[PDB]
Amino acid sequence: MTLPAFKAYDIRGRVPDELNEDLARRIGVALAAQLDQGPVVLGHDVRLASPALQEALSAGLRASGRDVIDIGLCGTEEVYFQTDYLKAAGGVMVTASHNPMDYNGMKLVREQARPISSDTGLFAIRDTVAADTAAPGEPTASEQSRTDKTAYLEHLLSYVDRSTLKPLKLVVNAGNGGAGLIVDLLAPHLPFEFVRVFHEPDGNFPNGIPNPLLPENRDATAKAVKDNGADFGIAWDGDFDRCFFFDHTGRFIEGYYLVGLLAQAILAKQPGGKVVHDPRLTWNTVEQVEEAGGIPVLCKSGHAFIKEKMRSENAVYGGEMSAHHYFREFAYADSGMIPWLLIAELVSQSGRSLADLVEARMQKFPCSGEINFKVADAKASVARVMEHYASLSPELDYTDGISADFGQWRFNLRSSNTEPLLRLNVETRGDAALLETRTQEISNLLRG
C-alpha cells in the first residue's frame, strides 16, 4: 500500500518499475518543501540511468524555486562534503551503490549532511510524493554546475602527514565505479605507486557489479596484489562509501579489525577522543580504543544511528564492521577514501605490514563473520537459542538485537524487520576452536 522504493534510510528500487524520472521529479518537489532555505547539492554515480534521474530531480527542485548545485559524477561522500562545505540546504546522491544493473536509488541529506531517514522526514516525503497528482511546473530557478573537486581533495589530504609517507605500492580496484577518478586526482600529491584494476568508470560493468564481497571481484584484487607484490590492496563499492582491504598476501581483511586499527590511528592524532562502534562485534574495538587512550561508545548499527550518536558525543571517529567509517572532521559522515589514506600512513610510519598489524588482533579475537539465516519464524528461532544457553547465565544487552556475553565468547543476533532473516556474529577471546563449535552449535539451533 506504499511506494516500495522508499526504505528506512534511503530510496532504492528497480528502474523503471519502482523508480523512474516521474517519481524523481516528484521527490524533487517534495524535497523542496522539507528543507530549510538554501540551494540543494545533486550528484550521481556511474549507473546508466543516474544522469536522467538526477535531471528529473533537478527539474522538480527548480520548479519549486530551489537553486541546484550540480556536482556531476561523484561518490556519495562528495555529496555529503559539498552539502556541508557550501552551507547548502540539503543534498541528494543518485546511486545504486553495489546493487544489480537494473537498480538505482537516492541518498538524501539536509543541512550539514544530516541524514533524512524515515524517522526524520523520508516518509513525509514519501507521503507527499504518493499524493502529488499535479502537472510538472516550469523551473523558476537556476542549475549551476560545480564539478571542481579541489576543496574535497584538499580535505582528504589533510588527514595525513605527507612527509611521513613511504612510496608504497597499492592495488586499487574501483570495480568500474567512481573511485578511480578520485585516486587519479590524489596521485600527483602522493608518493604511492598505484596498480589500477577495473579502473575506468563504466556503467555497463563489464567486470561485474562493483561489490568487493563477490568472490570473483575479491579474487581479481587478491591476484593483482600477489602478482605485483603490492603492500596492500583496496577495493570500493560503486559509490565508494565503503572500502575493503587486502593485505600483501592477498588475504581479504574482515572489516571488524579495521575499526580498531583506524581508531588507534585517529586517537594518535586526537588523543582521548570518543570512538563510536556497533554491537555486532565489539571486544577488539573496545580493547584497541582503550589501549590508545580513547573511550569506546556503543551504538545501534546503521549509518543514521551512528552519525547522530557521534554528533551527540562529539566522537572523533565511528566505525561499522561492514566497512562504513565515519569521521567528525568530515561533517560526521562516512568516507571510503579517508580510511585507506590513514592505513597507508600507519603502515608508512610504523614499518609494519598491514598483515602484521591485523594478524595480532585476529589471533586475539577470532570472529565468525556475519552469517545470515532465512528462517520460518524469527521469534521461535531466537527463543530456541536463548532457551538452549539460558543455563549458562550470559550477560544480555539489547542495544541492537540480542547480545549474549558468556565470558570467553559472545554473540550478537539481529533480526531483519523487512523479512524473517537472522544475522549472527560470534567472537571469542583467543579461541578459534571454541569459535567454530559455538558457531555451528548456534547454526544448528537456528536452522532446526
To the nearest whole angstrom, how small is the minimum distance from the Cβ of residue 122 to Ca ion? 18
Measured from the CB atom, the residue of 12 and 26 that comes closer to Ca ion is: 12
User: Among this protein's residues, is 97 annotated catalytic?
Assistant: yes
Which one of the spans 3-11, 43-51, 106-114, 238-246 is the region binding Ca ion (CB under 5 A)? 238-246
Residue nearest Ca ion, Cβ-based: 97
The nearest distance, CB 239 to Ca ion, in angstroms, is: 4
What's the closest the beta carbon of residue 245 comes to Ca ion, in angstroms?
16
Q: Would you say 97 or 173 has its CB closer to Ca ion? A: 97
Q: Which of 64, 97, 117, 403 is catalytic?
A: 97
How far from the centroid of its chain's Cα atoms is residue 380's Cα?
A: 31
- Contact between 71 and 41 under an 8 Å Cβ cutoff? The reply is yes
241 binds Ca ion (CB under 5 A): yes
Is 97 a binding residue for Ca ion by CB under 5 A? The answer is: yes
Q: Residues 98, 101, 102, CA angle at the centre, nearest 5°?
A: 115
Interacting span for Ca ion (CB under 5 A) from 229-237, 294-302, 386-394, 438-446 = 229-237
Instruction: Give 56 or 323: the residue with its C-beta nearer to Ca ion.
Output: 323
* Shortest distance in whole angstroms from residue 85 CB to Ca ion: 20
Among 78, 231, 239, 254, binds Ca ion (CB under 5 A): 239
Q: Which of 99/348 has CB closer to Ca ion?
A: 99
Q: Compare residues 239 and 320 and give the one whose CB is closer to Ca ion.
A: 239
Stretch that binds Ca ion, among 141-149, 241-249, 292-300, 380-388 (CB under 5 A): 241-249
Q: Which of residues 383-422 bind Ca ion (CB under 5 A)?
A: none
| In the complex, least distance from residue 406 CB atom to Ca ion, rounded to whole angstroms | 34
Touching Ca ion, residues 242-261 (CB under 5 A): 242
Q: What are the Cα distances from residue 64, in Å, to 40, 54, 58, 67, 247?
A: 12, 15, 10, 9, 50
How many residues belong to the site for Ca ion (CB under 5 A)?
A: 5
Task: Give the orientation angle of helix 122-131 with respect to helix 21-34, to 10 degrees.
Answer: 120
- Residue 320 sits in the site that holds Ca ion (CB under 5 A): no
Q: How far is the CB of 124 from Ca ion (least distance, A)?
A: 25
For Ca ion, which stretch binds (CB under 5 A), given 28-36, 94-102, 261-269, 434-442? 94-102
Least distance in Å: CB of 238 to Ca ion?
7
Write the binding mask 186 to 225 for Ca ion: x where contact by CB under 5 A, - elsewhere. ----------------------------------------
State the nearest-atom distance from the C-beta of 241 to Ca ion, in Å.
4
Among 77, 231, 237, 254, contact with Ca ion (rule: CB under 5 A): 237
CA nearest neighbour of 77 among 308, 210, 245, 236: 236
**Which residue's CB is nearer to Ca ion, number 149 or number 324?**
324
Of the two residues 28 and 212, which places its CB atom closer to Ca ion in the complex?
212
What is the footprint of Ca ion within residues 49-78 (CB under 5 A)? none
Q: What is the dihedral of CA 431, 432, 435, 439, to 10 degrees?
A: -170
For residue 241, how far is the Cα from the chain centroid?
Answer: 5
How is residue 282 written as a grid cell? 565489539
Closest to Ca ion by CB, 237 or 345: 237
Closest separation between CB of residue 189 and Ca ion, Å?
25
Within residues 330-349, the interface with Ca ion by CB under 5 A covers: none
Residue 239 or 308: which CB sits closer to Ca ion? Answer: 239
Amino acid at 399: T
Q: What is the 3-state secondary structure (H, E, C) of the chain?
A: CCCCCECCCCEEEECCCCCCHHHHHHHHHHHHHHCCCCCEEEEECCCCCHHHHHHHHHHHHHHCCCCEEEEEECCHHHHHHHHHHCCCCEEEEECCCCCCCCEEEEEEECHHHCECCHHHCHHHHHHHHHHCCCCCCCCCCCEEECCCCHHHHHHHHCCCCHHHCCCCEEEEECCCCCHHHHHHHHHHHCCCEEEEECCCCCCCCCCCCCCCCCHHHHHHHHHHHHHCCCCEEEEECCCCCCEEEEECCCCECCHHHHHHHHHHHHHHHCCCCEEEECCCCCHHHHHHHHHCCCEEEECCCCHHHHHHHHHHHCCCEEEECCCEEEEHHHCCEECCCHHHHHHHHHHHHHCCCHHHHHHHHHHHCCECCCEEEECCCHHHHHHHHHHHHHHHCCEEECCCCEEEECCCEEEEEEECCCCCEEEEEEEECCCHHHHHHHHHHHHHHHHC
The catalytic residue positions are: 97
Query: Interface with Ca ion by CB under 5 A: which residues?
Result: 97, 237, 239, 241-242
